[PDB]
Design a protein around this nucleic acid. Structure first.
Ligand SMILES: *O=P([O])([O])[C][P@@]([O])(OP([O])(=O)O[C][C]1O[C](N2[C]=NC3=C2N=C([N])[N]C3=O)[C]([O])[C]1[O])=O*
Ligand SMILES: [Mg+2]
Ligand SMILES: [Mg+2]
Ligand SMILES: [Mg+2]
Ligand SMILES: [Mg+2]
Ligand SMILES: [Mg+2]
Ligand SMILES: [Mg+2]
Ligand SMILES: [Mg+2]
Ligand SMILES: [Mg+2]
Ligand SMILES: [Mg+2]
Ligand SMILES: [Mg+2]
Ligand SMILES: [Mg+2]
Ligand SMILES: [Mg+2]
Ligand SMILES: [Mg+2]
Ligand SMILES: [Mg+2]
Ligand SMILES: [Mg+2]
Ligand SMILES: [Mg+2]
Ligand SMILES: [Mg+2]
Ligand SMILES: [Mg+2]
Ligand SMILES: [Mg+2]
Ligand SMILES: [Mg+2]
Ligand SMILES: [Mg+2]
Ligand SMILES: [Mg+2]
Ligand SMILES: [Mg+2]
Ligand SMILES: [Mg+2]
Ligand SMILES: [Mg+2]
Ligand SMILES: [Mg+2]
Ligand SMILES: [Mg+2]
Ligand SMILES: [Mg+2]
Ligand SMILES: [Mg+2]
Ligand SMILES: [Mg+2]
Ligand SMILES: [Mg+2]
Ligand SMILES: [Mg+2]
Ligand SMILES: [Mg+2]
Ligand SMILES: [Mg+2]
Ligand SMILES: [Mg+2]
Ligand SMILES: [Mg+2]
Ligand SMILES: [Mg+2]
Ligand SMILES: [Mg+2]
Ligand SMILES: [Zn+2]
Lengths: 306, 152, 59, 108, 148
RNA sequence: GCUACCUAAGAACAGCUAAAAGAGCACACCCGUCUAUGUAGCAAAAUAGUGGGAAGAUUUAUAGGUAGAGGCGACAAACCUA
RNA sequence: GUAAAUUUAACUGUUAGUCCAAAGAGGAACAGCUCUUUGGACACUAGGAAAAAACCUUGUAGAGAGAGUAAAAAAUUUAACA
RNA sequence: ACUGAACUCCUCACACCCAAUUGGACCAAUCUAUCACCCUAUAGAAGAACUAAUGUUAGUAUAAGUAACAUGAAAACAUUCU
RNA sequence: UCUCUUACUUUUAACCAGUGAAAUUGACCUGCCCGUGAAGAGGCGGGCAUAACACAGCAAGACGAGAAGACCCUAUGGAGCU
RNA sequence: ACCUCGAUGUUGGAUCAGGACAUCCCGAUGGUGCAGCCGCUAUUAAAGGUUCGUUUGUUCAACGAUUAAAGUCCUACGUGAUCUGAGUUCAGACCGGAGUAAUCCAGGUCGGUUUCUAUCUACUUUCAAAUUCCUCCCUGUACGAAAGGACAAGAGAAAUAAGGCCUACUUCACAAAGCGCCUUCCCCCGUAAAUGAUAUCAUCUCAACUUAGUAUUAUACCCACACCCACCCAAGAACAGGGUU
């Protein structure tokens, strides 16, 4: 039988730095080749209609930071950085469920040496280094973008509402008090080996427990979605988004960010770049920071009330 | 839940863990090669490298002398550390304490390992060598390397 | 398995393979009782007028 | 709590013989390049390690003879010599341990 | 019970009554005792009835061994190869005559569950049923919801 | 030979305050108020903490005596080889 | 119409019973409640009322890849007014 | 109009579907008398038959490879360290 | 102690290697709802669900396991005491 | 007195709750001896909620402070192989009484062992579409004779619950957490009204029909079949999962 193998098993002492340098230079050139999508052969750009839904991104949660507004209040922001985002493939409206067209979007770059063969074939046909995570965005087909294009962080604007979704922090096989917020039994008034138990789990007539019963079990490694997060500020040099409040998942995981689906923010996308912000044809480079009109900037006259 | 929680719990407490690592480290400084279970030599290797850093801080430094007086439990290894081990690595920065797996203990079937200081007048370990350059794959990659060298 | 051999479609459309397999459209149980605008005026000439209305009546 | 019925041999054979409990075939195994005695990858060969530990044991016995009692532990590098093998000029101040053998053809 | 024993289909051995009927018995091997009360009925059978039995249906070869045995037996061999051994231990003359007559009548197939007691070898004449029997054809063989 | 009581001749009780003391704190020792573990347990009654006594109606080493319709008992109808 | 009854000899065993229809008593003209009387069923096979002891049909024993039968399926939809 | 039983008819044979109790025909192993001589016969006899008494002894299963149980560290196996 | 719990260590715990029990066990190829039933069904009737199999938890049910109820009644069964 | 005495563990309390509506509150309507605020009664509505304390062991019960509300009932008077034994089901003893006495009390009181290693069924993230109070304006208006005093629309703040998070504070520290911070979106049907016959008026219609009237044929997650010795991990009991450029 065939034994296992890895990439550098049979490589020499001198060939390992050469292969690292070679493949690093190749996927750096591949990332730099897709830099100007508007000069290649772009798919037709449409104007915004009111019943439209555009694509999102995949960002990497750096950390948190405080952030002050002109009334004096303090808000906390999560810095989501868009590391290397690329539209991968497009599936038309009649080819998934007959409801809405889909777009695939890839996350940050990882090594070719640690993916399956069909995935490497897919990225070799597409022309990009392989991505860590791949999310599927429901869009309407007047917002379709060409596969292989770059998506940036100025896709979103300061003053908007996004919905971020990631895997929450996994806490292992957790007992019922930390998981479901049950109370326990009291501590010292006679209790025998029952300080954190679930107690009764059903009634006596039924002879079973219901399927929806709350019991101990693995807690916290599940996709959750944080709804209605305001984006306060966009940094365009490092491609960092500043969403309001907390975001599910640990730091340096990958989150999926798209604009809100709440009814209050149904059609606020008329002032947003629609197909996606293209930094080529803008004819005016954006500033290094795009602020909402409420946030105190770092260069500020140190607000005085009156 | 032990997210981001280094330092294994080894003995019967924190203090017994420090004493276990101290005995393993004193054996390492005396004999320059040790076999012990894998978790213990992992922890003791992390301690041994910074012990060599304290030895390289100098002999007249009172803090380095205090640390060598605590961590070395035989008191003859302190002149050895400050006059043999630290002058041996006067050029290097951090590459010492080579650790390798040896198969299993006989009785309780533990994962054992060997760590040694470099230098090491003892006979050398049977290290696994990376594959030779004259093989088929490496000659193909050498042809590719020479071709993209001449193309530049 | 007998329900796996059942093919049910909500409209006049049936896929091409299933239309290529077919034999013997079975007759329908109910008679579809044929509303009045489809009554082929000779049949209204067949049926008799059962009563004489008063001529001074409005409907 | 107590069993209410005897588990039969059919239920027991279904439990204690499934692939989650069987022994997994491993394929990390190949011949050692020297001495051919079937090491495992990521593991030092036990034959070659036995060679090195026997020679290290004899060197440590000669060191223990030369150091007299305990707590001696000199402040000079050591270096070992075999039969023949005059001390080099670079090994001047270094301690000289000579046992009696030919120098083996892996220790250079 | 029928799930616990084998079963065969009802069959003739070599199509007996079609051409000529052949006696399906080959042999009868008798082993009776000279002394011994267990073989008294068989002793009287060899006295009086085996001569008329041998004259009656001459296809069968009969052997009488006259051996010391505590249980006398009769071995009946048939044409298809089967061997049926029955004990005539302490039986009447009438019971032994009934037994050898029943062995003479039957054929050598197994006495197991006989499974559908009829063996038509061409069961249909007008043509066996298929779902296109009792179904009318349509012009140019058009299927339902066809166009041309 | 455990235990209830008795007889013979013995042994032990650091230190401090000692009011003089079947006195006070408190060791060794005797007993077992409360809690927790244990319940086929270390143990057919234990362990850890917390407790009462600890110069006396105290504890204890050895031998002997009282036996069942009875012995013994600061009466628990308590003990008399689980 | 029927074929059983009486007497003699010798024994064991049952003699802590339920439901249904009817005449009653007690209770609440309550109970799957208690007690008598008449009859039936069960503690014996089968079919039926959904599964069902006591309700209906049916009893004397087997093989059959024949047939005629007994009991055997609940029906109802409604308020104008001088 | 059909379906619908162990009821009835049809071919054959018929002792072959109740608790306690009673009556009857047979019958394996064992010993003895006489026969028998690859395992039987006629009689006499009895420690004369086990799907069941939290039945007795012994073997092996289930719970189960489960609960539980171990050896302070390096080394020259002289010694050293906590 | 609690409002209201949280963090760390050890024992315990999970895996690996060695040795290796005990109660319990009619047989089980061991599902849910409604109804029925010796009156509280995984095994009956009508519906629903349904590829096989490991491992760690919980204790709603198996009218769960140990002790032929210790409470109530009977025995022309005992015993202590007055 | 029908199963259960070769044992169905008994009252309250703790944890966890499931369900019925004959509804305590939040929703919407009819009537009123409904001028307004409070009210009474009836229909529909079970998606959600229904407090903390003193005494009695109490479930019952009295009281204090609240709240929109501190609902009834069933679940072996839910659930003790999840917990307590406070009384209530022994052996010691005291008091009152009965009995000559032993001894007793639906009389009181002090003390009085809660054993199980889970074999079988069932179950162990259903990924998501939250409720309620209060403040300002209206307004000191509608309403009355005065006292008194609203609905509706709008704005803002909160409390609880669910899901997450570590930048500040705090237990703490290369983590885990709350006392800390962020987010949280659709209805529900009882009636009130036009046209119009049976019955040429009239009539809201188990007459044909038209409105308040139906949120849904809802959208968000998640959906790449195989490099895998070994190392690391915000992933984890084992297994599984992610990275190794
Ligand atoms: O003697 P008295 O008991 O005080 C009765 P009095 O004072 O009534 P008066 O004048 O205080 O009015 C009471 C309220 O009426 C309001 N008012 C006066 N004029 C106007 C209004 N309100 C209006 N909306 N419009 C007017 O033109 C006053 O604001 C007051 O609150 O006589
Ligand atoms: Mg608590
Ligand atoms: Mg206890
Ligand atoms: Mg406890
Ligand atoms: Mg340990
Ligand atoms: Mg004293
Ligand atoms: Mg004292
Ligand atoms: Mg005494
Ligand atoms: Mg007394
Ligand atoms: Mg009765
Ligand atoms: Mg029939
Ligand atoms: Mg009959
Ligand atoms: Mg006997
Ligand atoms: Mg016997
Ligand atoms: Mg037997
Ligand atoms: Mg038993
Ligand atoms: Mg037995
Ligand atoms: Mg093991
Ligand atoms: Mg187990
Ligand atoms: Mg264990
Ligand atoms: Mg030990
Ligand atoms: Mg039931
Ligand atoms: Mg059962
Ligand atoms: Mg039980
Ligand atoms: Mg009994
Ligand atoms: Mg009597
Ligand atoms: Mg008596
Ligand atoms: Mg007597
Ligand atoms: Mg007596
Ligand atoms: Mg009765
Ligand atoms: Mg009972
Ligand atoms: Mg029992
Ligand atoms: Mg109602
Ligand atoms: Mg209860
Ligand atoms: Mg229970
Ligand atoms: Mg006490
Ligand atoms: Mg318990
Ligand atoms: Mg079971
Ligand atoms: Mg006023
Ligand atoms: Zn080797």
């Amino acid at each position: 039988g065939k034994s296992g193998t890895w990439w550098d098993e049979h490589l020499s002492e001198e060939n390992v730095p050469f292969i690292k340098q070679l493949v690093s230079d190749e996927d750096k050139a591949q990332l730099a080749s897709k830099l100007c999508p508007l000069k290649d052969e772009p798919w037709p750009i449409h104007p915004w209609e009111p019943g439209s839904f555009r694509v999102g991104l995949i960002a990497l949660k750096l950390g948190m930071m405080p952030l002050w507004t002109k009334d004096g209040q303090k808000h906390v922001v999560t810095l989501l950085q868009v590391q290397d985002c690329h539209v991968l493939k497009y599936t038309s409206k009649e080819n998934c469920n007959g409801k809405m067209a889909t777009l695939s979007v890839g996350g940050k770059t990882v090594s070719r040496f640690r993916k399956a063969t069909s995935i490497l074939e897919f990225y070799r046909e597409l022309g990009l280094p392989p991505k860590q995570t791949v999310k599927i965005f429901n869009i309407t087909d007047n917002a379709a973008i060409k596969p292989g294009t770059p998506l940036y962080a100025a896709h979103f604007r300061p003053g908007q509402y996004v919905d971020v979704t990631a895997k929450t922090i996994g806490k292992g096989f957790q007992g019922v008090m930390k998981r479901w917020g049950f109370k326990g039994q009291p501590a010292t008034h006679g209790q025998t080996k029952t300080h954190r138990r679930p107690g009764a789990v059903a009634t006596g007539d039924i002879g079973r427990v219901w399927p929806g019963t709350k019991m101990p079990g693995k807690m916290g490694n599940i996709y959750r979605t944080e709804y209605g997060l305001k984006v306060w500020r966009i940094n365009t040099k490092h491609n960092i988004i500043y969403v309001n409040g907390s975001v599910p998942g640990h730091k340096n995981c990958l989150v999926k960010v798209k604009d809100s689906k709440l009814p209050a923010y149904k059609d606020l996308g008329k002032n947003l770049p629609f197909p996606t912000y293209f930094p080529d044809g803008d004819e005016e480079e954006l500033p290094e920071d795009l602020y909402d009109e409420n946030v105190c900037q770092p260069g500020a006259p140190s607000i005085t009330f009156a | 839940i032990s997210h981001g929680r280094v330092f294994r719990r080894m003995g019967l407490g924190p203090e017994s863990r420090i004493h276990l690592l101290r005995n393993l480290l004193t054996g390492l400084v005396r004999h320059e090669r040790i076999e012990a279970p894998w978790a213990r030599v992992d922890e003791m290797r992390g301690y041994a490298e910074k012990l060599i850093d304290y030895g390289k801080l100098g002999d007249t430094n009172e803090r380095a002398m205090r640390m060598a007086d605590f961590w070395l439990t035989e008191k003859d290894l302190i002149p050895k550390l400050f006059q043999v081990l630290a002058p041996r690595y006067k050029d290097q920065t951090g590459g010492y304490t080579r650790m390798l797996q040896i198969p299993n203990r006989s009785l309780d079937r533990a994962k054992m390992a060997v760590i040694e200081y470099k230098g090491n007048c003892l006979p050398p370990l049977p290290l696994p060598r990376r594959d030779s350059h004259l093989t088929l794959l490496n000659q193909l990659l050498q042809g590719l390397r020479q071709d993209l060298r001449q193309s530049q | 398995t007998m329900m796996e051999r059942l093919h049910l479609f909500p409209d006049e459309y049936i896929p091409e393979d299933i239309l290529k397999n077919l034999v013997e459209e079975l007759p329908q149980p109910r008679k579809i009782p044929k509303r009045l605008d489809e009554y082929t005026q000779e049949e209204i000439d067949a049926f008799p007028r059962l009563w004489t209305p008063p001529e001074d009546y409005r409907l | 709590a107590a069993p209410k019925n005897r588990r039969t041999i059919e239920v027991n054979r279904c439990r204690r013989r499934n692939p989650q409990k069987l022994i997994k075939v491993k394929n990390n195994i190949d011949v050692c390049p020297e001495c051919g005695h079937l090491k495992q990858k990521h593991v030092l060969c036990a034959y070659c390690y036995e060679k090195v530990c026997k020679e290290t044991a004899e060197i440590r016995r000669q060191i223990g003879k030369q150091e007299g009692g305990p707590f001696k532990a000199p402040t000079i590098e050591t270096v070992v010599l075999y039969t023949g093998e005059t001390p080099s000029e670079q090994d001047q101040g270094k301690r000289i341990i000579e046992r009696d053998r030919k120098r083996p053809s892996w220790f250079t | 019970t029928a799930r616990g024993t084998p079963s065969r289909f009802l069959a003739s051995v070599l199509h007996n009554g079609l051409g000529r009927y052949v006696q399906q018995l080959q042999r009868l091997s008798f082993s009776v005792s000279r002394d011994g009360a267990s073989s008294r009925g068989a002793r009287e059978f060899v006295e009086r009835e085996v001569i008329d039995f041998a004259r009656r249906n001459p296809g069968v070869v009969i052997y009488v061994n006259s051996r010391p045995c505590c249980v006398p037996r009769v071995v009946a061999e048939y044409l298809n190869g089967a061997v049926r051994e029955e004990s005539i231990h302490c039986k009447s003359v009438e019971e032994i005559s009934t037994l050898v007559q029943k062995l003479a009548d039957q054929s050598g197939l197994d006495v197991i569950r006989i499974r559908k007691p009829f063996h038509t070898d061409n069961p249909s004449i007008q043509g066996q049923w298929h779902p296109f029997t009792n179904k009318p054809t349509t012009f140019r063989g058009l299927r339902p919801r066809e166009v041309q």
